[PDB]
Amino acid sequence: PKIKKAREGVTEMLLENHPLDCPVCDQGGECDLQEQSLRYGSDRGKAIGPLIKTSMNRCIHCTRCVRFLNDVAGNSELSANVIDLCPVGALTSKPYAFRARPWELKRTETIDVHDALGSNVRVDTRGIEVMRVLPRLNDEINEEWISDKTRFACDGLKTQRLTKPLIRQGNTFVDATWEEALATIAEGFQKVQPKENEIKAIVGSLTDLESIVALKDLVNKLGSENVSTDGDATTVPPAHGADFRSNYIFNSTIDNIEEADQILLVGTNPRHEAAVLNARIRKVWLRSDLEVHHVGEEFDSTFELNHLGSDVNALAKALTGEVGKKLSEASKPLIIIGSGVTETQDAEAVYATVAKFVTSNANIVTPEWNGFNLLHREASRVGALDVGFTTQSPEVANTKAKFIYLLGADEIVNKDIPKDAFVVYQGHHGDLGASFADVILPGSAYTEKTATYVNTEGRVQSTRAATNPPGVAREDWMIIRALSEYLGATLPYDNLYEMRSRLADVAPHLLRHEVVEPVSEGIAKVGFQSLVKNPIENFYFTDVISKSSPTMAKCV
Amino acid sequence: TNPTAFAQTTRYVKDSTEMRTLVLNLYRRYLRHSRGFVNNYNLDIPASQVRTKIRQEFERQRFVKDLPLKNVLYMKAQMEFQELVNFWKQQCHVMQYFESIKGDSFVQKFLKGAQ
Amino acid sequence: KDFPTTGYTEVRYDAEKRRVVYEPLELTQAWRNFTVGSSVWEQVGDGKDFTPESFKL
Amino acid sequence: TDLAKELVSGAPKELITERVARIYQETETWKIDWDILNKGNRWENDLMGYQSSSDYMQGTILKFDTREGAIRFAKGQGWDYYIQEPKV
Amino acid sequence: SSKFVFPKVVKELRFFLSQTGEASVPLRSFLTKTYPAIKKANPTLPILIREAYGIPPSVTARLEKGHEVKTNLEGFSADQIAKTLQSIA
Amino acid sequence: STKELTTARIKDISKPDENNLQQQAPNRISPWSKSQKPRAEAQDNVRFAVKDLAKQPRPYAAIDLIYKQPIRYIEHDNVAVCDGNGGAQGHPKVYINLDQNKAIPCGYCGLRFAQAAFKEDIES
Ligand code: SF4
Ligand code: SF4
Numbered sequence A: 001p002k003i004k005k006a007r008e009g010v011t012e013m014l015l016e017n018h019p020l021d022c023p024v025c026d027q028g029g030e031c032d033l034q035e036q037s038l039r040y041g042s043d044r045g046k047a048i049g050p051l052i053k054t055s056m057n058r059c060i061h062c063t064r065c066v067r068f069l070n071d072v073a074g075n076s077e078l079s080a081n082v083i084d085l086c087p088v089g090a091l092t093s094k095p096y097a098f099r100a101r102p103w104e105l106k107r108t109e110t111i112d113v114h115d116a117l118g119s120n121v122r123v124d125t126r127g128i129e130v131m132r133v134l135p136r137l138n139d140e141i142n143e144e145w146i147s148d149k150t151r152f153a154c155d156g157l158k159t160q161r162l163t164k165p166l167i168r169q170g171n172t173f174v175d176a177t178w179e180e181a182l183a184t185i186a187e188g189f190q191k192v193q194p195k196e197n198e199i200k201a202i203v204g205s206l207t208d209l210e211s212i213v214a215l216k217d218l219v220n221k222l223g224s225e226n227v228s229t230d231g232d233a234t235t236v237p238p239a240h241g242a243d244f245r246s247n248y249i250f251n252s253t254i255d256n257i258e259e260a261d262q263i264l265l266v267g268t269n270p271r272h273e274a275a276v277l278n279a280r281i282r283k284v285w286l287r288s289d290l291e292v293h294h295v296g297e298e299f300d301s302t303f304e305l306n307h308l309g310s311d312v313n314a315l316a317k318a319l320t321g322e323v324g325k326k327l328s329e330a331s332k333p334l335i336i337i338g339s340g341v342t343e344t345q346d347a348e349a350v351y352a353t354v355a356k357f358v359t360s361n362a363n364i365v366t367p368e369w370n371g372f373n374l375l376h377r378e379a380s381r382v383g384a385l386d387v388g389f390t391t392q393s394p395e396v397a398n399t400k401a402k403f404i405y406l407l408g409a410d411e412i413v414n415k416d417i418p419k420d421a422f423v424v425y426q427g428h429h430g431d432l433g434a435s436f437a438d439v440i441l442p443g444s445a446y447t448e449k450t451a452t453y454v455n456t457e458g459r460v461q462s463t464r465a466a467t468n469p470p471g472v473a474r475e476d477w478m479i480i481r482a483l484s485e486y487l488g489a490t491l492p493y494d495n496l497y498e499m500r501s502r503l504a505d506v507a508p509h510l511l512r513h514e515v516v517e518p519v520s521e522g523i524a525k526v527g528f529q530s531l532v533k534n535p536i537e538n539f540y541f542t543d544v545i546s547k548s549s550p551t552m553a554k555c556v
Numbered sequence B: 001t002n003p004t005a006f007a008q009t010t011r012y013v014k015d016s017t018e019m020r021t022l023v024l025n026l027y028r029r030y031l032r033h034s035r036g037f038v039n040n041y042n043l044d045i046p047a048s049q050v051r052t053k054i055r056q057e058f059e060r061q062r063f064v065k066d067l068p069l070k071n072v073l074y075m076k077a078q079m080e081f082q083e084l085v086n087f088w089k090q091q092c093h094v095m096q097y098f099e100s101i102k103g104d105s106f107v108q109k110f111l112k113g114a115q
Numbered sequence C: 001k002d003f004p005t006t007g008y009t010e011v012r013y014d015a016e017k018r019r020v021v022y023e024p025l026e027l028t029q030a031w032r033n034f035t036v037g038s039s040v041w042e043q044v045g046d047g048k049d050f051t052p053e054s055f056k057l
Numbered sequence D: 001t002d003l004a005k006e007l008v009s010g011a012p013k014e015l016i017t018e019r020v021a022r023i024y025q026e027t028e029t030w031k032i033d034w035d036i037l038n039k040g041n042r043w044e045n046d047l048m049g050y051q052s053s054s055d056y057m058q059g060t061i062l063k064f065d066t067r068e069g070a071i072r073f074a075k076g077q078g079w080d081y082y083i084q085e086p087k088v
Numbered sequence E: 001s002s003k004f005v006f007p008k009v010v011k012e013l014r015f016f017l018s019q020t021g022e023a024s025v026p027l028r029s030f031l032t033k034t035y036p037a038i039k040k041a042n043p044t045l046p047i048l049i050r051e052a053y054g055i056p057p058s059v060t061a062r063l064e065k066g067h068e069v070k071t072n073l074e075g076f077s078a079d080q081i082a083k084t085l086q087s088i089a
Numbered sequence F: 001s002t003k004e005l006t007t008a009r010i011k012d013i014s015k016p017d018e019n020n021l022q023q024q025a026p027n028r029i030s031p032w033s034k035s036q037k038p039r040a041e042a043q044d045n046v047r048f049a050v051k052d053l054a055k056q057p058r059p060y061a062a063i064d065l066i067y068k069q070p071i072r073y074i075e076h077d078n079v080a081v082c083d084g085n086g087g088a089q090g091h092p093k094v095y096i097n098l099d100q101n102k103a104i105p106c107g108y109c110g111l112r113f114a115q116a117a118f119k120e121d122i123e124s
């Protein structure tokens, strides 16, 4: 009819100066110019970064590369989202350029592990190699946005990988079988004969929860309790404590941020600590009457703050002055504590000061709202706390342990590892934590395993396997049970379901996939009764995969 | 058109008891041809061995319950009888039919690669 | 539809057995699946009716 | 649903037990595919770099129409499965 | 007090209950009020609370050498819960 | 010398030899792609034991036959048109904007272009 000419008009106009670059387009097989110049149209007729392969020759304009920048992201931690927004191949990804075609890539739906958000992503693989990671829509967490760290650390899994067991003979690791590796640990285990507190276990940021739970059973049957993550919590028991869920979870969850009034930043840099949520605050900060006050080390943000200072004593006058008066006035006030609090010297002062303001008012904690939340940055801390994988005595943390078994742990420079101790590292990369090792057991990349992860909001999100582990690597926990038989501490778990069967005894929420079990208003207030410098140096050197990623070498 | 040797019409039996008697005669038919299967296919196993394997075949799946799935199992077993008695399967397939076939601990499977 | 296009087993010759034997499937090159980049949009609509008017309400 | 149809489909014994089928939704219909093998799903051939495989269900996808229709099929064949609810 | 400070065998305490419903009414009450008594006196005994949607009340503690004995607390009163937890050791 | 043969480079420090059967190509030693397997490594296989290396296919490397070709120049215009330089049996026609001040290669042929003014500047 007459209407169809409109499609035949706009289609003709767009394909006027357009380059004939379809064979050489990076995303030539999925641009919404071809697929929309076929169904509706007729038939006849500078650079911005080491991340985005700009070619405005292929633009159709619409300034979506412009409208997004001044709205969501605003030297930008989120500028890579422009790649997924431009329909035509005007702005294509540089690292992925000229490597794959969409009709060949296999897609899997999984989650990020770089930060504690655990945003839903879609991974496009090719055989035994991951090509690109794209975000999959989820309004509850991310909603189409992932930081440049997540989507450009993919190639970090193609180098530095541990593919074989390694054994130290002198000062250089050698290629040794699994039979000897699982014995050299047990052989040297009884050479030094560690005592009850002479065995230590450190869990890394990327270590999954199945290994975290399954390691305790192996540790317990050998009688040890020097187990915790690779943080630097001055208080040996966690200041929030693993006792109650509400002590360390985003009781609001992500879907309860856009309806807030007052937000408190307890020593944090949300731009560098959670990019997805940082823009979420910026999106609200534009139209709403949002008020956010800065309490912590000074930094640079996409948005101004009601900045106060840099010291803890700045917060002393906050909850009692007009800074905290609006918190009382807020129908849905927000308190956020970053992962950089427990590391600080005054971590204990943080919880008592704030929870006194959460045990005072009643509008903060309603049957529909909880004003206190935590913002961790690792994907293994919350999993550790929901399973009680943390110590509860400074004396145990002071022991000069003779056998430290690392499980994904890297940030252990401030951890006093005795020189004479027996250090066994199990992981999937060669980095800081690997040098300290004596017998190395290769693990699995997060895309190569079915690992049940827990984000900073308490949501239990697992992964679906994408590729087989490289070389002769095995699953993370499967080594521990394999290691169990070599020490006389065999675990009764013989398949991945039984590992989830064990999780049933740990808690009921661990077996609810994509389902968040909250803390009830009648109990979370009891958990409140228990209580009564930016942690990150380099944005592009935070996790193991980023450090080994050739792409991030262009981000420095 | 003239149907071949050892043929039966494909009929949807609507009785529980009749199917019981049809099977029993069928099992005897296999045992009657025990000597032939050895001589026809030149099997290395003697006549008693074939009956032993046939019994292991018939004992294996005697506990089925669904009548609609009883006829299907009787129909296809008839084809197996008809194919074997008419000397249709090659020699190799019968030799490998009887030549098919305890697990291992988790450490054994972990080391080599499991599945 | 649930039967795989490559089948479950394939045969070869085993010299020790001196016969051609079935064996579980093994592919040196697996069947690449290119349906993933299929159409995400609509292709064809209702069309134009041609029903003779004698067969309508 | 109660029928042991696996004795008439002729499928190998491993499909009933050792394989897991995902019922997902890519935007109006549902699909079934089998999760990848632990090892031997894809190994690089040492001759020409071909993507070898021993999994015979890698290339199989069944296009369904309705969710309950897919679940009816999985129970009919005696298949272990799990269902992935799409995000709204 | 009395027997609140559990012996050295008790190394992990887990408290599981339903956020909603009526079945977990009593278990919430016992843990809500009596928590501070054991907590301060037993500094190194973890007090694990893991909530759920409608599951019956259930409390199981972990002994030495990685052993647990399953214990149920479905439908007890607000004071008989202490009695049931006394018998573990 | 066991160093450049297994590393990808823009050019070759040494002058290549046509008669060296360990090079990636007769006209280039180091491979021209990061993922490309060096020829010296590949020939160290079981199937090259008795097979003669002289007769194996060793086509000349592409990344050299282009850089020998002198850069084309455009006079008094800033749009370069290239369609294979062979008629209707070439690559699809592409227009090259000459605003940037260096040699911008063609999409398919790899031919490089310039302007009238920057002829002295680009050649530096
Ligand atoms: S954006 Fe689409 S239409 Fe334009 S050149 Fe690339 S593939 Fe062709
Ligand atoms: S987003 Fe793409 S199509 Fe829109 S103006 Fe930018 S380059 Fe052009």
Ligand SMILES: [K+]
Binding pocket: A027, A083, A084, A085, A086, A087, A088, A089, A090, A091, A092
């Ligand atoms: K694009």
Ligand SMILES: [Zn+2]
Binding pocket: F082, F083, F084, F085, F091, F106, F107, F108, F109, F110, F111
């Ligand atoms: Zn050209």
